[PDB]
Write an enzyme that holds these catalytic residues in place. Structure first.
Site, PDB file in Angstrom:
ATOM      1  N   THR A  76       0.941  -1.315  -0.134  1.00 44.36           N
ATOM      2  CA  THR A  76       0.016  -0.151  -0.124  1.00 44.36           C
ATOM      3  C   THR A  76       0.881   1.301  -0.107  1.00 44.36           C
ATOM      4  OG1 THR A  76      -0.191   0.338   2.541  1.00 44.36           O
ATOM      5  CG2 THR A  76      -1.582  -1.240   1.285  1.00 44.36           C
ATOM      6  N   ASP A  92       0.081  -9.167   7.586  1.00 44.53           N
ATOM      7  CA  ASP A  92       0.867  -8.943   6.666  1.00 44.53           C
ATOM      8  C   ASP A  92       1.701 -10.109   6.389  1.00 44.53           C
ATOM      9  OD1 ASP A  92       0.005  -6.274   5.831  1.00 44.53           O
ATOM     10  OD2 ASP A  92       1.216  -5.354   7.129  1.00 44.53           O
TER      11      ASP A  92
END
Ligand code: ADP
Ligand code: ADP
Ligand code: ADP
Ligand code: MG
Ligand code: MG
Ligand code: MG
Ligand code: MG
Ligand code: MG
Lengths: 106, 211, 526, 525, 538, 49
Positions: free
Chosen positions: D91, D392
């Site tokens: 991101t 993650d």
């Protein structure tokens, strides 16, 4: 004292520290004792306290007089608490406890 | 929020890259406004004051003065252009454009971590080299009537309409040549500029006397 | 006191005369100017801010117009005609607005010259009839059996949108969806893409992975984890009634005096659930999809027979599944028959996309419903892609209903304008001037194309008009990219005749409606 | 403008103004999120309106927590949210690449070039870049070492080095435990349960489940060595008749009889459970644990406890599947036909008490197809940060397993892609070469930001890396300790192929769509 | 030329009320300043000579205490960094039970020295790494500093002597008496099984007689009254019921359907006879005390009085569970008579009055039982609250000693020894980490310095004397508060000792908090909201 | 996502009450409209009638 854009505690917090706050506490205890001094002994005199509603509580007992007082000073409330304690454990001497405590402090 | 903010709560501060971005944005905005001014093909602007007075103009200095700006960098550039106009009387739009482009090209490298001091040193070296080249490229000449006419054309065509520029070229060249004394500084106070408001705008001319 | 006496209530304003006509025409022109730049293959997208906090980054004229709020009533009428054009044919929304604005603009000229609006309206209607005649004359037929030509038509429809980059994939998707949705029953042809061509947007992935499924896809999951999530050739049973125990509508109260009646009542509730599950199981299905809830006991009884169940599915999705797999929704399972059992689905897979479970009933044979699975960068990109796909599907349906095509890129505009001018050349009345005015105002589309292309309007448009003065040049338009005049029989840009007919009719009729209006009155209450 | 003429209370930006607004917003987001990229990035403190503390380094969390009310920021936030939802990483790189693409495009648009040509160049460069990425990926058999390297490359960027080292083993073992051959990985089978009593390095992996609730009866055993697990979804508390039954009696004895009779329905199911427990274990050696999704009233709890059965009520819905996969039993919705083969087996069950909160552990399973991650930390924000980091890491490991290929990291791939795009630029017809150059210079932002965050400077570090890549052709990245070029494949700095492909596609699409916007409008009121 | 506009980019996009702080000066130094201020506020309460603070919370409930965790809890801290330090202190309190003030002092010293290190030029990462290395070294060193172990926890004298140091920090004047009381209370609990439960010690505060009259009771005390005529039982055979002491009713709905006059005339008599039969059946088991968790019906109370049964009603389920634990009875869900194993036994149950408070006492005679109760006397509610906090600290110290028996010298001896050893280690480490290691070592000086400041003597001479003695080779020498001049004495002889786990966890948590605060570079604060608290906090 | 900010540059530097009209549609067409309106107001008094 600097503004310190982000402050530690919420604004409006009051802090008093050192000898002056202790002397002020002693003075508050003196005021509390003076509020009940004249009710002690066979020559004592009663006190009349009127609440917000308009009811009158004529009394000579020290604990009752202290309870009817709307005391908000943190150090002064100790005298009211010990008057309540003396009333609870024994039932007499609620004026002597406050007088003696204030006299020690003075 | 910073050092100054603590001492003066009502203080407005922009520090480091914030200040650089503020200055560069102001310069770029000024350049964007005055881009359309340059050249004889530029576009006239209509400026209306508070009282309602109408002033059609193309001059960079006039437009800078009559723009509604309250920016510090704009004020600095306006002062620079005012000094340019006071001394030489031309090049204000070029001043603003070159300043804005210098700041933009500098920021193109500064955003890549380069310190502005290096850019300023490069600017100094480039400026001295450019001055040398300009000294080498200038054309020494005898300022006869034709050369003065050409210079007056190059200015007035950028300032006004082509026919009015053609008339004003002869007017101004003759006016200067009339008051010019050999080997003496020219006193521009001796050319009265009196305006009358009854004929067409191409009827302006030169009178070998006073009005 | 003595409050004032007056005929009409307060705050009741009134205007009249040439002021109202000028205001109406100016409002229409402003509405046209809002979206003028969003026409042609070189259009620039616009970014609209929803009052709810959303963002609509779109190129469609109808979306832009419906996303704004106006106070002038003529602007409201313009928005209404844009919506009408969008609903009727599916595209041409940002062309009808421009045409109507231009027609009103050229009518203002005659209004200021002491010409009564009725004469202008009569001339406008004559012009509209002759436009219809000319378009029907210059049209060309299409054989819908040729898939290449259909793909070309859809492409020419979508070159002006943001999906032109993946035009080939988009055209294939739209054509396949429209073909599968096409259906016939009782001698009534039906192409209902708004109910059985569902577009599902899942943000993420790459848009090249978007495809049309030979089935349906719903955002659901098995009620119980032990149920199968992968069945090869499922037999589907669809229900729209609860599999739970529910009260009756009559006010029924029990009165328990014996000890065992309570346990008996609970046991009969369980037995009722078991009886319903046995009635379902008797057909031996593989998956049971319900519109209402399924009780846990019913889940257990179904699982004992190795049956996957999905609990709550919307009415539209259930109808779409019924169309796809050939099932038939039944309310009471006791009336369930063999014909109601849905066989025809080739696979039922419940996979995981991102952090969600999605149910696929794809691989059907002869499915009459479809789900267009869209994947892309974000939600707004997917919304714009969905709008473009809607435009493509509408164009495909229009071509399927009407196989007539007309040249695009302004060629039709100039051809009709020249025909109208030639016909008007024989007119003798005062009506000829507004007639010719409408004829030349029809030329706004090629002018707008040239303006958006960035080329020079005057010389290119004059050359185009000169070309159309010749006899066999009805298919000569402009390039939306290179700004040159080309024969559209060579470039290949065509649009359905129905779209052009609807656009011209709506534009001329909006001009007529706004010309008939005078003496605006406002302020009164319902 | 026209909009203000129609709607007076309308806010409109046109053409150059629209480009300026969009590019300024993108530049602001890029400037904020520059400091995030790389393991050498700076953590941010995020204080909400209620005073909640949020320490984080993730790009998506930061974007969701910055107090921003900008349209273009909203668009970029949506793109990053889709990135995180699908792939779970990149991101910050997404935002940086979008901002750099917009800045490089503006560098040419300000000189009179039309944005359409820039977008055409962007499309051509994106196609060539995707081809090169296809060419450069490293197909590998995903053993434990490669997965550990990928998990390290993610977690070291997300958290402290030692905590990252612990979480690498935790995440890799967790994924390998539930992974089945040629079968999609269900991340719902990795329960992430967090406690708040020990240090951050105490986070570990339990080959079983940890339930955030315990037994409600004090007399139930607090620890069972060998246990049979019964996973049930049957109500064991009093249930009311659906048809408004009510009772009618004429004496106290009748009331007592009706009171005793009304419990028979629940008592029958409790008796079935007790009979099964007696049948499976005739002695006290083995234990019995009942985990129920629905309530268990005190009468049933007492009845079960008198038989030495541990009962847990109101368990999570996913816990049914997790227990069936780990313990190995069958989740039951009714006790109509319950047999010993439907019981799961757990080799140890015990209860842990944490102040007012109670936990139950289920370990020593045979082949647990579902495991749990125990997040331990002294602070709530530490727990939240570790939870985001393990999310993650799990996403990265799952992507690495799903895509048999992995891509060298440390910015090497962007440098190689930029060089390939520069080499391919002459083949592009027209002025789209400017867009291609802008795309290459935008791709080059990742090594630049890495050098910035590592304390070096962009210019000479980047030129050294580019010269090294040209001289040898190896995929040389950025060494965050020395700044010298370094082969990422050899040192084990890997990036997910899916993440890179998603970055390319999404960034190019959103940049092209933003560059073609010439009017922001707001007239809905 | 009179206004400075907001910088383009993030500054303009920030919301109306938000605040964004970035960089060293704007973020790290401000956070360090806030943490230093918090530590300075709490500092004066450290040690035996620390003085209480009157704190008024937002509800105007007065707190007077020198417990750091309580003061922080009753202080409305707003700065996020100080909030983080407070969270570290509260975690220290929850994990161990004492050492919170140590946590604040150490964290503040660490952050101040980190600020000065950043000023001289060290980077944040280098300071963080140095602190981590020094914390690891300190954790390695600490076990070698252990002087003596508890080596017995069933004794009374030894346990009291061990807990005296823990409860001398609070209530400095009278700690021997409190130590004896808490030692007896904890020794009654802690059976042969090694597990010790903190919640098995109950504290009952009855006002009036001064805290010197407090006692420990092998039983449990309730501030309630008996609901029957019987007010004293000699050989209690308690039967505990969780159901209301009344006839059961149907859970669906109960309507008495009467169709004949005979049923109407006999219903009440039958119900009364049923209740009488149930009560007599309960009494026939020998149960002479009945404890119920619900309401008591009038007929049930009358029939209980008829059979000489004490009635005690406990509203709280926690009280019922604790009574079952301390008596050994099983909470029956129905009103059936208890079987012999379910009937609890207490050596004496009686209604009594203490001061003006009526209490019900479940009193044993054996020096055993699952639960022991300490009755606290006094003259003020605040005084008894402070005594209760001291009791909690002592009980947590006993629990820690059960967990780990190792002890380290107190009075600042351990901190000075740690500082000396860490400084010695740092001098042998080349590189920029040596400055951070030395500063971490110097941060240990804040404990003896605070002790000396509170005791009223000059700190510097105390610290120099401590270094002199420690260099001589005495590792168990600390501050001597019983002197008007800066002086030191051996802590082992004085018996001033601290738990090893307490120091270990305090060091770990303080270092973790300081490092985590240092790790923050940018702060983005949302606009404060006046919402009535998040729903999670209820 | 609910407010369009002023474009950076000259748009932000403009004073509070000032107006800036630039471009064909915003300036030339509006000036032509104003002049046409003025001529319309004065038109009806032309000639003997
Ligand atoms: N490649 C092209 N060259 C020239 N004109 C084109 C091209 N593609 C489409 N057009 C024209 O553009 C118009 C479609 O533009 P569009 O944005 O779809 O407007 P609408 O939404 O009103 O249909 C059609 O009238 C068509 O003639
Ligand atoms: N130890 C390392 N050495 C060199 N480069 C690294 C190292 N760790 C990560 N990187 C590079 O830095 C980038 C880290 O990006 P990251 O902070 O994870 O952003 P996001 O979370 O948005 O993916 C990766 O692209 C990777 O190539
Ligand atoms: N008699 C004593 N003489 C010297 N120091 C003491 C004595 N009793 C306690 N201390 C010191 O006081 C400290 C306890 O401080 P305290 O107020 O309990 O803070 P906290 O509650 O955070 O532990 C211990 O470190 C111990 O060394
Ligand atoms: Mg008396
Ligand atoms: Mg000039
Ligand atoms: Mg169209
Ligand atoms: Mg990452
Ligand atoms: Mg302590």
């Amino acid at each position: 004292m600097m503004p310190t854009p982000v402050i530690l505690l919420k604004e409006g917090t009051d802090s008093s520290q050192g000898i002056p706050q202790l002397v002020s506490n002693i003075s508050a205890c003196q005021v509390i004792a003076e509020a009940v001094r004249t009710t002690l002994g066979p020559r004592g005199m009663d006190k009349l306290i009127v609440d917000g509603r308009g009811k009158a509580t004529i009394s000579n007992d020290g604990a009752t007089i202290l309870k009817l007082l709307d005391v908000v000073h943190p150090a002064a409330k100790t005298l009211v608490d010990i008057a309540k304690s003396q009333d609870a454990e024994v039932g007499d001497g609620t004026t002597s406890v406050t007088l003696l405590a204030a006299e020690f402090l003075k | 929020m910073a050092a100054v903010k603590t001492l003066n709560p009502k203080a407005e501060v922009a520090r480091a890259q914030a200040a650089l971005a503020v200055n560069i944005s102001a310069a770029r905005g000024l350049q964007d406004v005055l881009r359309t001014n340059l050249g004889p093909k530029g576009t006239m602007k209509m400026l209306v004051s508070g009282a309602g007075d109408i002033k059609l103009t193309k001059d960079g200095n006039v437009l800078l003065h009559e723009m509604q700006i309250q920016h510090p960098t704009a004020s600095l550039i306006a002062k620079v252009a005012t000094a340019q106009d006071d001394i030489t009387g031309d090049g204000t739009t070029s001043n603003v454009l070159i300043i804005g482009e210098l700041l933009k090209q500098a920021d193109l490298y500064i955003s890549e971590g380069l310190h502005p001091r290096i850019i300023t040193e490069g600017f100094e070296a480039a400026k001295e080299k450019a001055l040398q080249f300009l000294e080498e490229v200038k054309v020494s000449r005898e300022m006869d009537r034709e050369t003065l006419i050409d210079v007056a054309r190059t200015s007035l065509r950028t300032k006004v309409h082509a026919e009015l520029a053609d008339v004003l070229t002869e007017a101004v060249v003759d006016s200067i040549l009339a008051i010019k004394k050999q080997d003496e500084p020219i006193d521009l106070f001796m050319i009265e500029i009196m305006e009358m408001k009854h004929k067409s705008e191409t009827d302006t001319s030169l009178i070998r006397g006073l009005v | 006191g003595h409050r004032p006496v007056l005929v009409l209530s307060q705050n009741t304003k009134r205007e009249s005369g040439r002021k109202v006509q000028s205001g109406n025409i100016n409002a229409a022109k402003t509405i046209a100017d809002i979206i003028r730049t969003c026409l042609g293959p070189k259009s620039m997208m616009k970014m609209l801010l929803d009052p709810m906090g959303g963002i609509v980054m779109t190129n469609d004229g109808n979306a832009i117009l419906r996303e704004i709020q106006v106070q002038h009533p003529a602007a409201k009428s313009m928005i209404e005609i844009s919506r009408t054009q969008d609903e009727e044919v599916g595209d041409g929304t940002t062309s009808v607005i421009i045409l109507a604005g231009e027609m009103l603009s050229v009518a203002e000229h005659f209004l200021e010259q002491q010409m009564h609006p009725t004469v202008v309206i009569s001339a406008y209607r004559k012009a509209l009839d002759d436009m219809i005649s000319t378009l029907k004359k210059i049209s060309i037929p299409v054989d819908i059996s040729d898939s290449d030509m259909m793909l070309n038509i859809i492409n020419s429809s979508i070159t002006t949108k943001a999906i032109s980059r993946w035009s080939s994939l988009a055209c294939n998707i739209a054509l396949d969806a429209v073909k599968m949705v096409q259906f016939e029953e009782n001698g009534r042809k039906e192409i209902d893409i708004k109910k059985y061509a569902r577009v599902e947007k899942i943000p993420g992935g790459i848009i090249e992975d978007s495809c049309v499924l030979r089935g349906v896809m719903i955002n659901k999951d098995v009620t119980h984890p032990r149920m199968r999530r992968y069945i090869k050739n499922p037999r589907i049973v669809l229900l729209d009634s609860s599999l739970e125990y529910k009260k009756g509508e009559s006010q029924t109260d029990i009165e328990i005096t014996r000890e065992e009646d309570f346990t008996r009542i609970l046991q009969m509730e369980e037995e009722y659930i078991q009886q319903l599950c046995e009635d379902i199981i008797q057909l031996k299905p593989d998956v049971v999809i319900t519109e209402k809830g399924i009780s846990d006991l019913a889940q257990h009884y179904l699982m004992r027979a190795n049956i996957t169940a999905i609990r709550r599915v919307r009415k539209t999705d259930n109808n779409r599944i019924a169309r796809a797999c050939g099932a038939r929704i039944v309310s009471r399972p006791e009336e369930l028959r063999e014909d109601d059992v849905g066989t025809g689905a080739g696979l039922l897979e419940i996979k995981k996309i991102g952090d969600e479970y999605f149910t696929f009933i794809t691989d059907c044979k002869d499915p009459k419903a479809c789900t267009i699975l869209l994947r892309g960068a974000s939600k707004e990109i997917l919304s714009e892609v969905e709008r473009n796909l809607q435009d493509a599907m509408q164009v495909c349906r229009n071509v399927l209903l009407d196989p007539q095509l007309v040249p695009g890129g302004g060629a039709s505009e100039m051809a009709v304008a020249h025909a109208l001018t030639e016909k008007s050349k024989a007119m003798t009345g005062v009506e000829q001037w507004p007639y010719r005015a409408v004829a030349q105002a029809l030329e706004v589309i090629p002018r707008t194309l040239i303006q958006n292309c960035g080329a020079s309007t005057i010389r290119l448009l004059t050359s185009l008009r000169a070309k159309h003065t010749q006899e066999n040049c009805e298919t000569w338009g402009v390039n939306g990219e290179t700004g040159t005049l080309v024969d559209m029989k060579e470039l290949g840009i065509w649009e359905p005749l129905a779209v052009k007919l609807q656009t011209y009719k709506t534009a001329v009729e909006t001009a007529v409606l706004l010309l008939r209006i005078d003496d605006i009155v406002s302020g009164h209450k319902k | 403008a026209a909009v203000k003429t129609l709607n007076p209370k309308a806010e409109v930006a046109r053409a150059q103004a629209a480009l300026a607004v969009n590019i300024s917003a993108a530049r602001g987001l890029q400037d904020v999120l520059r400091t995030n990229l790389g393991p050498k990035g700076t953590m941010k403190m995020l204080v909400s309106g209620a005073g909640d503390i949020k320490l984080t380094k993730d790009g998506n969390v930061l974007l969701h927590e910055m107090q921003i009310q900008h349209p273009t920021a909203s668009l970029i936030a949506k793109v990053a949210t889709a990135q995180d939802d699908i792939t779970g990483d990149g991101t910050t790189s997404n935002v940086l690449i979008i901002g750099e693409l917009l800045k490089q495009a503006d560098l040419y648009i300000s000189e009179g070039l039309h944005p359409r040509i820039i977008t055409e160049g962007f499309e051509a460069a994106k196609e060539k870049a995707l081809q090169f990425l296809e060419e450069v990926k490293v197909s590998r058999e995903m053993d434990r070492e490669t997965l550990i390297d990928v998990a390290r490359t993610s977690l070291r960027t997300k958290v402290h080095a030692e905590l990252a080292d612990v979480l690498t083993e935790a995440v890799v073992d967790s994924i390998l435990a539930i992974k089945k051959q040629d079968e999609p990985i269900d991340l719902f089978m990795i329960e992430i349960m967090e406690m708040k009593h020990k240090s951050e390095t105490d986070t570990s992996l339990i080959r079983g489940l940890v339930l955030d609730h315990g037994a409600r009866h004090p007399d139930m055993k607090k620890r069972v060595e060998d246990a049979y697990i019964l996973t049930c979804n049957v109500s064991l508390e009093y249930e009311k008749t659906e048809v408004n039954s009510g009772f009618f009696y004429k004496s106290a004895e009748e009331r007592e009889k009706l009171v005793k009779a009304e419990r028979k329905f629940i008592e029958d199911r409790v008796k079935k459970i007790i009979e099964l427990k007696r049948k499976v274990c005739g002695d006290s050696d083995k234990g019995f644990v009942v985990i129920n999704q629905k309530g268990i009233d005190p009468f049933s709890l007492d009845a079960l406890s008198k038989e030495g059965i541990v009962a847990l009520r109101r368990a999570k819905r996913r816990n049914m599947e997790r227990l069936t996969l780990a313990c190995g039993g069958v989740a039951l919705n009714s006790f109509d036909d319950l047999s010993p083969d439907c019981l799961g087996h757990a080799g140890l069950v015990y209860e842990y008490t944490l102040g007012e909160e109670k936990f139950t552990f289920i370990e020593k399973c045979n082949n647990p197809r579902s495991v749990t991650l125990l997040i331990k930390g002294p602070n709530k924000h530490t727990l939240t940060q570790i939870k985001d980091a393990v999310r993650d890491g799990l996403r990265a490991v799952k992507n690495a397993i799903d895509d048999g290929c992995v891509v060298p990291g440390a910015g090497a791939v962007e440098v190689a892609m930029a060089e390939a795009l520069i080499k391919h630029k002459p083949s592009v017809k027209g002025r789209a070469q400017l867009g291609v150059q802008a795309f290459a210079d935008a791709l080059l932002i990742i090594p630049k930001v890495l050098a910035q965050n590592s304390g070096f400077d962009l210019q000479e570090t980047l030129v050294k890396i580019q010269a090294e890549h040209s001289e040898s052709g190896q995929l040389v990245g950025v060494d965050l300790n020395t700044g010298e070029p370094m082969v990422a494949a050899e040192v084990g700095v890997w990036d997910n192929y899916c993440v890179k492909k998603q970055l390319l596609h999404s960034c190019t699409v959103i940049a092209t769509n933003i560059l073609l916007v010439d009017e922001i409008m707001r007239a809905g009121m | 030329a009179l206004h400075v506009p907001k910088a383009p980019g993030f500054a303009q996009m920030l919301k109306e009320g938000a605040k964004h702080f970035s960089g060293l000066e704007e973020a790290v130094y401000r956070n360090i300043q806030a943490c230093k201020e918090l530590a300075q506020t709490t500092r004066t309460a450290y040690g035996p000579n620390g003085m209480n603070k009157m704190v008024i919370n937002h509800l105007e409930k007065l707190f007077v205490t020198n417990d750091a965790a309580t003061i922080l809890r009753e202080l409305e801290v707003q700065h996020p960094a100080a909030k983080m330090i407070v969270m570290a202190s509260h975690m220290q309190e929850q994990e161990v039970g004492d050492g919170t003030n140590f946590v604040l002092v150490f964290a503040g010293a660490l952050l101040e020295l980190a600020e000065e290190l950043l000023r001289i030029g060290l980077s944040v990462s280098e300071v963080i790494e140095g602190y981590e290395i020094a914390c690891r070294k300190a954790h390695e060193i600490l076990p070698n500093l252990v002087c003596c172990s508890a080596k017995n926890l069933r004794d009374i004298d030894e346990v009291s002597s061990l807990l005296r140091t823990s409860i001398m920090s609070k209530q400095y004047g009278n700690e021997v008496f409190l130590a004896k009381l808490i030692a007896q209370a904890c020794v009654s609990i802690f059976p042969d099984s090694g597990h010790f439960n903190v919640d098995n010690i109950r504290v009952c505060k009855i006002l009036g007689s001064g805290i010197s009259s407090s006692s420990v009771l092998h039983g449990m005390v309730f501030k309630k009254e008996t609901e029957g005529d019987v007010t004293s039982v000699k050989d209690a055979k308690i039967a505990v019921y969780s159901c209301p002491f009344d006839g059961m009713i149907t859970e669906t709905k109960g309507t008495v359907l009467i169709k004949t006059a005979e049923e109407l005339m006999n219903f009440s008599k039958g119900e009364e006879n049923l209740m009488d039969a149930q009560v007599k059946a309960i009494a026939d088991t020998g149960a002479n005390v009945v404890v119920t968790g619900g309401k008591v019906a009038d007929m049930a109370l009358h029939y209980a009085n008829k059979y000489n049964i004490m009635l005690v009603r406990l509203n709280s389920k926690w009280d019922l569970r604790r009574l079952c634990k301390t008596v050994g009875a099983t909470a029956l869900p129905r009103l059936t008579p208890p079987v012999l194993e379910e009937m609890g036994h207490c050596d004496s149950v009686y209604l009594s009055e203490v001061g003006d408070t009526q209490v019900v006492v479940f009193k044993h005679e054996k020096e055993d039982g699952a639960i022991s109760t300490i009755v606290l006397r006094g003259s003020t509610d605040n005084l008894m609250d402070d005594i209760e906090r001291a009791v909690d600290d002592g009980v947590n110290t006993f629990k820690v000693l059960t967990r780990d028996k190792r002890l380290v010298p107190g009075g600042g001896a351990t901190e000075i020894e740690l500082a000396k050893q860490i400084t010695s280690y740092g001098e042998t480490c080349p590189g920029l980490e040596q400055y951070a290691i030395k500063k971490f070592a110097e941060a240990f000086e804040a404990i003896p310095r605070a002790l000396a400041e509170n005791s009223g003597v000059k700190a510097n001479e105390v610290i120099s004397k401590l270094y002199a003695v420690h260099q001589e080779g005495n590792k168990n020498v600390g501050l001597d508060i019983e002197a008007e001049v800066p002086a030191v004495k051996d802590m082992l002889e004085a018996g001033i000792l601290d738990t090893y786990l307490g120091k270990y966890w305090a060091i770990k948590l303080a270092t973790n908090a300081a490092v985590t605060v240092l790790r923050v570079d940018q702060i983005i604060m949302a606009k404060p909201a006046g919402g009535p608290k998040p729903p999670s906090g209820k």
